[model samples]
Target: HGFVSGAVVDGKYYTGYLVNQYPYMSSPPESIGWSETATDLGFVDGSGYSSGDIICHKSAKNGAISAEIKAGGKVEFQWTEWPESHHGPVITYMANCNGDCASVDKTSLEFFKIDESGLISDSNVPGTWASDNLIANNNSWTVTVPSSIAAGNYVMRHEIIALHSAGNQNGAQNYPQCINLKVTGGGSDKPAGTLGTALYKNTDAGILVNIYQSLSSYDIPGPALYSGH
Candidate 1:
């Protein structure tokens, strides 16, 4: 564990000298968005949900999304918000029209990889699924931190599965859960203030536990949404 102190200069708060510290990761995962069409998915959703449309619920509201990748990639996209009820929005992109629910059983998958450049390395994929049972096999996933991605703040964006065994009583629920990732190290290069760093029970291997929260989004200093487009 590490200890820190702060001093109030006028109304400003500053790290009051170095009291104590520990070794930990400094970089966290940044959010990314994705959009694709069914044609891109190589399949046609018989249901009304078209390919390339944002992945939304068969009803109306938008729910949470969870994702996982082996290593090497990034995700990006925009949504109204997590679907709250049976009328939730589906998660998807503009190009693909992800179809609505049909059978009780359903599955979807995708792969992602981040190149050394810090940007998404895979171009073949739009990051969103256009059809059902989409499998991203080659490269499971990768968490890429750009050289420009200093140690301060960042966002992480990815789509998740919404599988239901019974009826469509509930909207599509994010299969897995998404979390904020942060990287921490030493040196002043890190952004000022206390970055969210700690080890949780379910942290992945070969990586330290860290999370960053900034008022700004991944693009600017705001939510990861394209207000411009």
Candidate 2:
């Protein structure tokens, strides 16, 4: 099971929580890492989760403050580990919090996907998926904040959908983590958004499929990535 550990903004690395589910699931750790189940530590089948459950993994919230970065900078998300068998895409989204992200309500955040990396090659059963790219990069995925984004407080949603077991209904695993960012730079294009619930349904082709066989291409399950170019 892979979970978001923290992020590197600018050149500094910041930690909100840990990856070993035990450290936090055993006892509550005030971290941005969302728990899967109070007891299990990892249970993610996107479709079965309630509308609100998918937002922040059942009541997960932001840390007290935010990581500061230039608008064009990148936030390198560090994960615990991404297994080769868990092949799928890595997606990132952002929403303007208006004021402070720490206090912003989860339901109020309208997220617009900013970046996505899906099928790279049809070379294997899992087909050299996007997670393989992250693994090659030392289990990290860097989402670049578009330079065109206006500077302000924003919540960045970084997620990975592991489709290794997608052959069954609601077998896909979705690991979503968030970070509050105080973007500092110049540009002025606010991207539109979609509620977290609208991001995907369990039955979406990408979420329910047989990846163990030879593949062609994958339809990344979500809204189109916002290209602020």
Candidate 3:
């Protein structure tokens, strides 16, 4: 099956949907395996994620944080909307015999969901309820994102576990890896702003957040200093 992956790196939006499922399941007759949407010019790499952190960020790459969202909406939002091509069972499906699913083989799987509750959860044995990246590229896992991502100053808290099954018929050998994220008041879906502006703001002074707010703030240098016409 085709895998679906998308994230807001910076101020630009880079959406990677499964253009094809021919990566490992294609015949030689097929040419290119999978294709992705043209790189969104706004793509940026500003999101900072590390082990053991749950942070929710309002994806406001530009303008006031409030302006980034709709009325009563939040700039801090999760990608709850699944891709148009994302249509499948709530969980991964495997061939079953007598109501019992067989063991998962060597596979690279990345699953995520937006649960009814606005809490992010990951697929980890002995897991906890928090929002974080659960799986890396080489891990098989699932993640639950919060459904109620209201506009405000927030952060995303989450956890992750990378595991390998040693040919175990029942349970798989699991490895634990935790991660976290911090979202400032700015950084849009574009790529340039997410890291350069977002991360730099977190470490140094976030000039973008200040600049965006300055343009809309009620307190400007001087309110409408009119020159006599």
Candidate 4:
């Protein structure tokens, strides 16, 4: 719910504000851009998208204002307040827009994942979702723009899945936050993978696990990473 209002890239910071007055998926005007102000800043209820779909958290609101970044550059999301209790995998994806991603509609914004950080080792580590330590850590994450991507504006969807209570049906919470970007550079690489809706099945091992209990290993839910990466 409460997520990044702007991004930090190449020693430059973008300016934007958080909307704290509306309910999840209820933010008005789907045309919101990175240069404009938004209203409301709150968490979406725990029962997220229970209808067996993986759409944006609030498709109705105007999207974040568009920011600029270079291809192969690093983009960092600045969260307003990231809850420590929510834990799972952190993934980033990008969808090419013909021109400006700020104007793209949700249905036309299909994405291809670029960076995914999951369980690195079974050993317990604080501030890591795998070892159940990522609860109270830095609220920012740095993701690299694919080096091979072509120049264009893109819709970057950064997300985290909180499986703290996923042992129960429909307990897993998905936080799919979006940012608009205008990337400058050139390359022919086209990232390919499953769409968010097809990324997981409710019965998947990682989606239905009890993180509070011990386990020999963990599998991150989703399709195999694209070969371009």
lDDT of each: 0.21, 0.77, 0.20, 0.62
State the lDDT of candidate 1 residue by residue for 74-130, as single tens digits.
333212122212111122111101222121111231111111111122132222221
Model 2 compared with the native: what TM-score? 0.89
Tens digits of per-residue lDDT, candidate 4, 6-52, equal 67765578643344432344544433232222234332223434322
Model 3 lDDT tens row, 1-229: 1122332322323332222332234541211111222123111112322111111112211111111222121212222322222111121111101111111111111112221111122233322212122222222233322223222222121111111111122111111111111223332221111211111222222111222112222111101211210
Better of 3 and 4 by TM-score: 4
Off by over 4 Å in 2: 19-41
lDDT of 2 by residue, 133-170 (tens): 99999999887888888899888888788888888888
Residue 84 lDDT (model 2): 88
* lDDT, residue 215, model 1: 14
TM-score of each: 0.21, 0.89, 0.18, 0.78
lDDT of predicted model 3: 0.20
The model with the greatest lDDT is: 2
Q: Model 2 misses residue 225 by how many Å?
A: 1.1
Better of 2 and 3 by lDDT: 2
Model 3 TM-score on a 0 to 1 scale: 0.18
Ranking by lDDT: 2, 4, 1, 3
